[PDB]
CSV table of C-alpha atoms and ligand atoms in Angstrom, one decimal:
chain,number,residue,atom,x,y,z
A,1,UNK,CA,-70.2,34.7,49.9
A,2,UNK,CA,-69.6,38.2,49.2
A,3,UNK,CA,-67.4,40.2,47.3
A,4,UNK,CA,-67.1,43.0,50.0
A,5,UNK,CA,-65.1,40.2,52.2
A,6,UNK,CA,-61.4,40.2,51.0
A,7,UNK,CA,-61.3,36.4,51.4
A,8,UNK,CA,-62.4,33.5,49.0
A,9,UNK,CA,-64.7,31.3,49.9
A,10,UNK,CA,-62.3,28.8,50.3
A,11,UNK,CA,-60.1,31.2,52.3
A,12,UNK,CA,-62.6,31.9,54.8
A,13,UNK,CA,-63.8,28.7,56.2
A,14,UNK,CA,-59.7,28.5,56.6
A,15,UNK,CA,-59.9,31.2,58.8
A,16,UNK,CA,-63.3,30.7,60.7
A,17,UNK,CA,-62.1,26.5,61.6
A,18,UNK,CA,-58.6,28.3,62.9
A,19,UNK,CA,-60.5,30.9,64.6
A,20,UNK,CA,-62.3,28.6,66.3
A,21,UNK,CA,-59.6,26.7,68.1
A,22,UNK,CA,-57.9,30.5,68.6
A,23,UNK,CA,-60.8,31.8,70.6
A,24,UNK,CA,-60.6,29.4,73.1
A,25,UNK,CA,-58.7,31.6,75.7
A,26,UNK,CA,-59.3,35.1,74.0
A,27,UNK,CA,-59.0,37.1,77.4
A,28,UNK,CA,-55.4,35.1,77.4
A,29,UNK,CA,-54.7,36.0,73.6
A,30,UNK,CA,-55.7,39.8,74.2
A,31,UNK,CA,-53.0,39.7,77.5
A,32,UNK,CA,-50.7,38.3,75.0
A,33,UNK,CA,-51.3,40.9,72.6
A,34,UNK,CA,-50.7,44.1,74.7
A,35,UNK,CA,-47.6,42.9,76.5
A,36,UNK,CA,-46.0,42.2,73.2
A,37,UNK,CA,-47.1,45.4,72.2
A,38,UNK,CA,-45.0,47.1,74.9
A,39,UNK,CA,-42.3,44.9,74.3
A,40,UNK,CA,-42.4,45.8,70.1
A,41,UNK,CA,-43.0,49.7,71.1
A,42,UNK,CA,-42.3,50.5,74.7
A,43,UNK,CA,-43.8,54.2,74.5
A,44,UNK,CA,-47.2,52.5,73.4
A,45,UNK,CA,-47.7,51.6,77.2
A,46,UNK,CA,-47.9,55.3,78.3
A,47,UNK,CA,-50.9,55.7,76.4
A,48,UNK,CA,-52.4,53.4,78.4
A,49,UNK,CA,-51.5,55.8,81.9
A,50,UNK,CA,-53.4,53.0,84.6
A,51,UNK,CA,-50.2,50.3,83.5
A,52,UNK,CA,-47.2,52.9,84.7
A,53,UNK,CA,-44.6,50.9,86.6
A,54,UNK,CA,-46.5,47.7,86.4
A,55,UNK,CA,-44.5,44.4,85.3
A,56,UNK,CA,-46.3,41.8,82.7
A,57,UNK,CA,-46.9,39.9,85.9
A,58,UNK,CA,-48.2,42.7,88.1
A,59,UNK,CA,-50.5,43.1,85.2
A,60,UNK,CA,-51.9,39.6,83.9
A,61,UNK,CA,-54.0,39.7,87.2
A,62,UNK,CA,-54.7,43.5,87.0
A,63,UNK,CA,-58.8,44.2,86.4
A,64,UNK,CA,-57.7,47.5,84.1
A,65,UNK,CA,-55.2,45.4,81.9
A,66,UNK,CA,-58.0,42.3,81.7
A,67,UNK,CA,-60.4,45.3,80.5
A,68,UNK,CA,-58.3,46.7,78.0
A,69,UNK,CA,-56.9,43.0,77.0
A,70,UNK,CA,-60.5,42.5,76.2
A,71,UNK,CA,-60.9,45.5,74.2
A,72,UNK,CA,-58.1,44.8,72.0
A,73,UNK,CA,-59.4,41.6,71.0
A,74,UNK,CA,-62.9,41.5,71.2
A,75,UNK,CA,-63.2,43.1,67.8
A,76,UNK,CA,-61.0,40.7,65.8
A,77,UNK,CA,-63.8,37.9,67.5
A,78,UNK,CA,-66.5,39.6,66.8
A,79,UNK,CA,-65.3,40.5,63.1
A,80,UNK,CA,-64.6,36.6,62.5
A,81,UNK,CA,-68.4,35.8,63.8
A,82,UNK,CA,-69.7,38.4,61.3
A,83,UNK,CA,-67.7,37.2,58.3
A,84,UNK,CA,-71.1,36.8,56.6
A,85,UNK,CA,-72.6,39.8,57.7
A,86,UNK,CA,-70.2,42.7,55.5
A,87,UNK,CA,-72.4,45.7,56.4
A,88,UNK,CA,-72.2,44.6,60.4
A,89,UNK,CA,-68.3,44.0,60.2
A,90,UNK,CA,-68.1,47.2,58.5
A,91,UNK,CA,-69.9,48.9,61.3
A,92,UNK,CA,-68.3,47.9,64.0
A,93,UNK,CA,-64.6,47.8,62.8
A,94,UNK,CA,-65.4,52.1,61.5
A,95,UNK,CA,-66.1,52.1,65.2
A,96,UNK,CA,-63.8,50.9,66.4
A,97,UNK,CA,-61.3,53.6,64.8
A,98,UNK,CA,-63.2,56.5,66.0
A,99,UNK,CA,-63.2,55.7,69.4
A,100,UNK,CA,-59.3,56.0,68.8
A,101,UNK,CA,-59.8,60.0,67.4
A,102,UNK,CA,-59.5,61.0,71.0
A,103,UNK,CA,-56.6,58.9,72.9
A,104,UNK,CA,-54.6,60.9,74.1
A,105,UNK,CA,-50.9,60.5,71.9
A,106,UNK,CA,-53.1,58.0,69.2
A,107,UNK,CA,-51.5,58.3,65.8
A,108,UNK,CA,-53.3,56.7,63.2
A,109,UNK,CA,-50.2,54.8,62.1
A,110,UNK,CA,-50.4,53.2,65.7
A,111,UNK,CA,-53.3,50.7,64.0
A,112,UNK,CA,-51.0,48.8,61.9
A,113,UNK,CA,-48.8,48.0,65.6
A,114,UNK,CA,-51.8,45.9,66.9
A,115,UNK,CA,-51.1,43.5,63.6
A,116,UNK,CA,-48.0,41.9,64.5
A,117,UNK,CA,-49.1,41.5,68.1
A,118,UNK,CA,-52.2,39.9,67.0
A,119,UNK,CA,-50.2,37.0,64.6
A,120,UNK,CA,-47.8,36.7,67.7
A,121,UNK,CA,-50.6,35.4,69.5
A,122,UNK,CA,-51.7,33.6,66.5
A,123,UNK,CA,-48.4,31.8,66.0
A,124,UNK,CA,-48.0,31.1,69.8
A,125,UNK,CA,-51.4,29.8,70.3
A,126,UNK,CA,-51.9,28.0,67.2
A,127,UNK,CA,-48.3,26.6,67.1
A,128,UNK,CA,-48.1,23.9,64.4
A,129,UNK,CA,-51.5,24.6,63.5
A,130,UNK,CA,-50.2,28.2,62.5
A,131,UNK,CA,-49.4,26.1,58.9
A,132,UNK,CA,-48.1,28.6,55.7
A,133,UNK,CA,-51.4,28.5,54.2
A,134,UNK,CA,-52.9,30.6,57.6
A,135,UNK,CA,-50.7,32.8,57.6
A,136,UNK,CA,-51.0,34.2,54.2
A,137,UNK,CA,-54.8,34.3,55.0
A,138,UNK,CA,-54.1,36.2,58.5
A,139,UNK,CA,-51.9,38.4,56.5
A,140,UNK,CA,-54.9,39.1,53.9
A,141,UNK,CA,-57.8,39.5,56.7
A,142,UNK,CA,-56.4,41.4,59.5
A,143,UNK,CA,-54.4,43.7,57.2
A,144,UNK,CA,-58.0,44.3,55.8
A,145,UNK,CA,-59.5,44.6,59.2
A,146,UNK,CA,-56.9,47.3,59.9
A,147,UNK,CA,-57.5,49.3,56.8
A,148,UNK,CA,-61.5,49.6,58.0
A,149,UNK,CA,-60.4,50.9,61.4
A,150,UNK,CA,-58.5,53.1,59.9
A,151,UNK,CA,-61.3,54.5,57.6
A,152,UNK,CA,-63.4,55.1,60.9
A,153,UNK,CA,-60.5,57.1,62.5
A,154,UNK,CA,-60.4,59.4,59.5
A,155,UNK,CA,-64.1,59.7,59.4
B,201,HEM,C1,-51.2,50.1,68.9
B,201,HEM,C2,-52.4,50.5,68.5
B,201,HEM,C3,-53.4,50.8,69.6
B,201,HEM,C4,-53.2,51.4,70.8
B,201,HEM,C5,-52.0,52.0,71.3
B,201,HEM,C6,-54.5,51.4,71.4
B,201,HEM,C7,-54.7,51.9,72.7
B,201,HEM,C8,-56.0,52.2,73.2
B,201,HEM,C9,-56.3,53.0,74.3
B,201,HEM,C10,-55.3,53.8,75.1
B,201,HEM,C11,-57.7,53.0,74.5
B,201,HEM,C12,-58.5,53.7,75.5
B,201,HEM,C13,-58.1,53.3,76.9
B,201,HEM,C14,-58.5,51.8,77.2
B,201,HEM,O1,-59.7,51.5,76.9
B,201,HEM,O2,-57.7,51.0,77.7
B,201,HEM,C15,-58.2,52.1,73.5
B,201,HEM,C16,-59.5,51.8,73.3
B,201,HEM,C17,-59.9,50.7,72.5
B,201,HEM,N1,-59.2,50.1,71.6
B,201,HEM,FE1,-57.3,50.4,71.1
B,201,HEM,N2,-55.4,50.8,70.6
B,201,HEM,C18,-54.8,50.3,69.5
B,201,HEM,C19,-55.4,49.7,68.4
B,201,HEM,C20,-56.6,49.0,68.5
B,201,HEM,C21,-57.0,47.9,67.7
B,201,HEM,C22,-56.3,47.4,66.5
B,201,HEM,C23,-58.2,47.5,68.2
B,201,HEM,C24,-59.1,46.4,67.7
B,201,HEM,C25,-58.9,45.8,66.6
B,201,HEM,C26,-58.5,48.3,69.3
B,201,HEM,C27,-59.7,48.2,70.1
B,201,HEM,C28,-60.0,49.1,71.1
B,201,HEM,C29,-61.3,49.2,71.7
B,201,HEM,C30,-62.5,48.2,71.4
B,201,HEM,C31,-61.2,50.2,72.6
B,201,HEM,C32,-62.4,50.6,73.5
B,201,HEM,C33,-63.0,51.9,72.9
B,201,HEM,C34,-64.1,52.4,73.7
B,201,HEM,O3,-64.6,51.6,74.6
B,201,HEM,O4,-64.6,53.5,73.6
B,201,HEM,N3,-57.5,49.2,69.5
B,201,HEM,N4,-57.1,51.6,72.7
């Protein structure tokens, strides 16, 4: 354990178990995540110019929308997988928000967007296994997830 990570250690083998049956289909979650997105915040999809006049099903096949599906998920996998590793997690999530500095119409409020979208996919996925006690410590994690990010972006 260590006292960097936001969660217990109680709390995080919680999360890492759920994870686990979460990152089965993580290519599907990511799809999941940006169409709910544009659904939540419709102008969010023009900032992503290769998806203009495409429907959800136009895209779920689409090799641009499978890279950028991936992009928006890979790093909630790959933070879960360093839980133990603080100084890595912390690298790679400050990353994450500076490759944001430059996207064309990207607001730093915009972070906080990708939270619900990411418990949709949770709640869907999971569905009874999405129990009271996760949510609280999805709540916990990815809101402190997004605050990192959003250290890198101001950076
Ligand atoms: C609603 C808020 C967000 C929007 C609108 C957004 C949109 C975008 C756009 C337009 C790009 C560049 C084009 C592309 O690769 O498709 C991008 C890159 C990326 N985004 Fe986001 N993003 C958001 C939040 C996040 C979050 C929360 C994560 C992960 C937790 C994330 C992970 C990434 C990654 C990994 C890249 C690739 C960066 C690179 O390869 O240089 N984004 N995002």
């Amino acid at each position: 354990s260590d006292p960097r990570f936001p969660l217990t250690a109680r709390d995080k083998f919680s999360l890492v178990k759920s994870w686990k049956t979460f990152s089965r289909n993580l290519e599907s979650a990511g799809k999941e995540m940006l169409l709910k997105l544009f659904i939540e915040h419709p102008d969010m999809k023009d900032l992503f110019p290769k998806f203009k006049a495409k429907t959800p099903d136009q895209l779920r096949n689409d090799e641009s929308f499978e890279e950028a599906a991936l992009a928006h998920i890979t790093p909630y996998d790959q933070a879960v997988q360093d839980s133990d590793n603080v100084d890595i997690l912390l690298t790679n999530l400050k990353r994450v928000g500076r490759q944001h500095k430059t996207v064309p119409g990207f607001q730093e409020s915009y972070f906080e967007r990708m939270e619900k979208c990411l418990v949709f996919a949770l709640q869907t996925t999971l569905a009874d296994a999405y129990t009271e006690n996760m949510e609280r410590i999805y709540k916990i994690w990815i809101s402190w997830t997004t605050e990192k990010i959003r250290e890198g972006f101001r950076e």
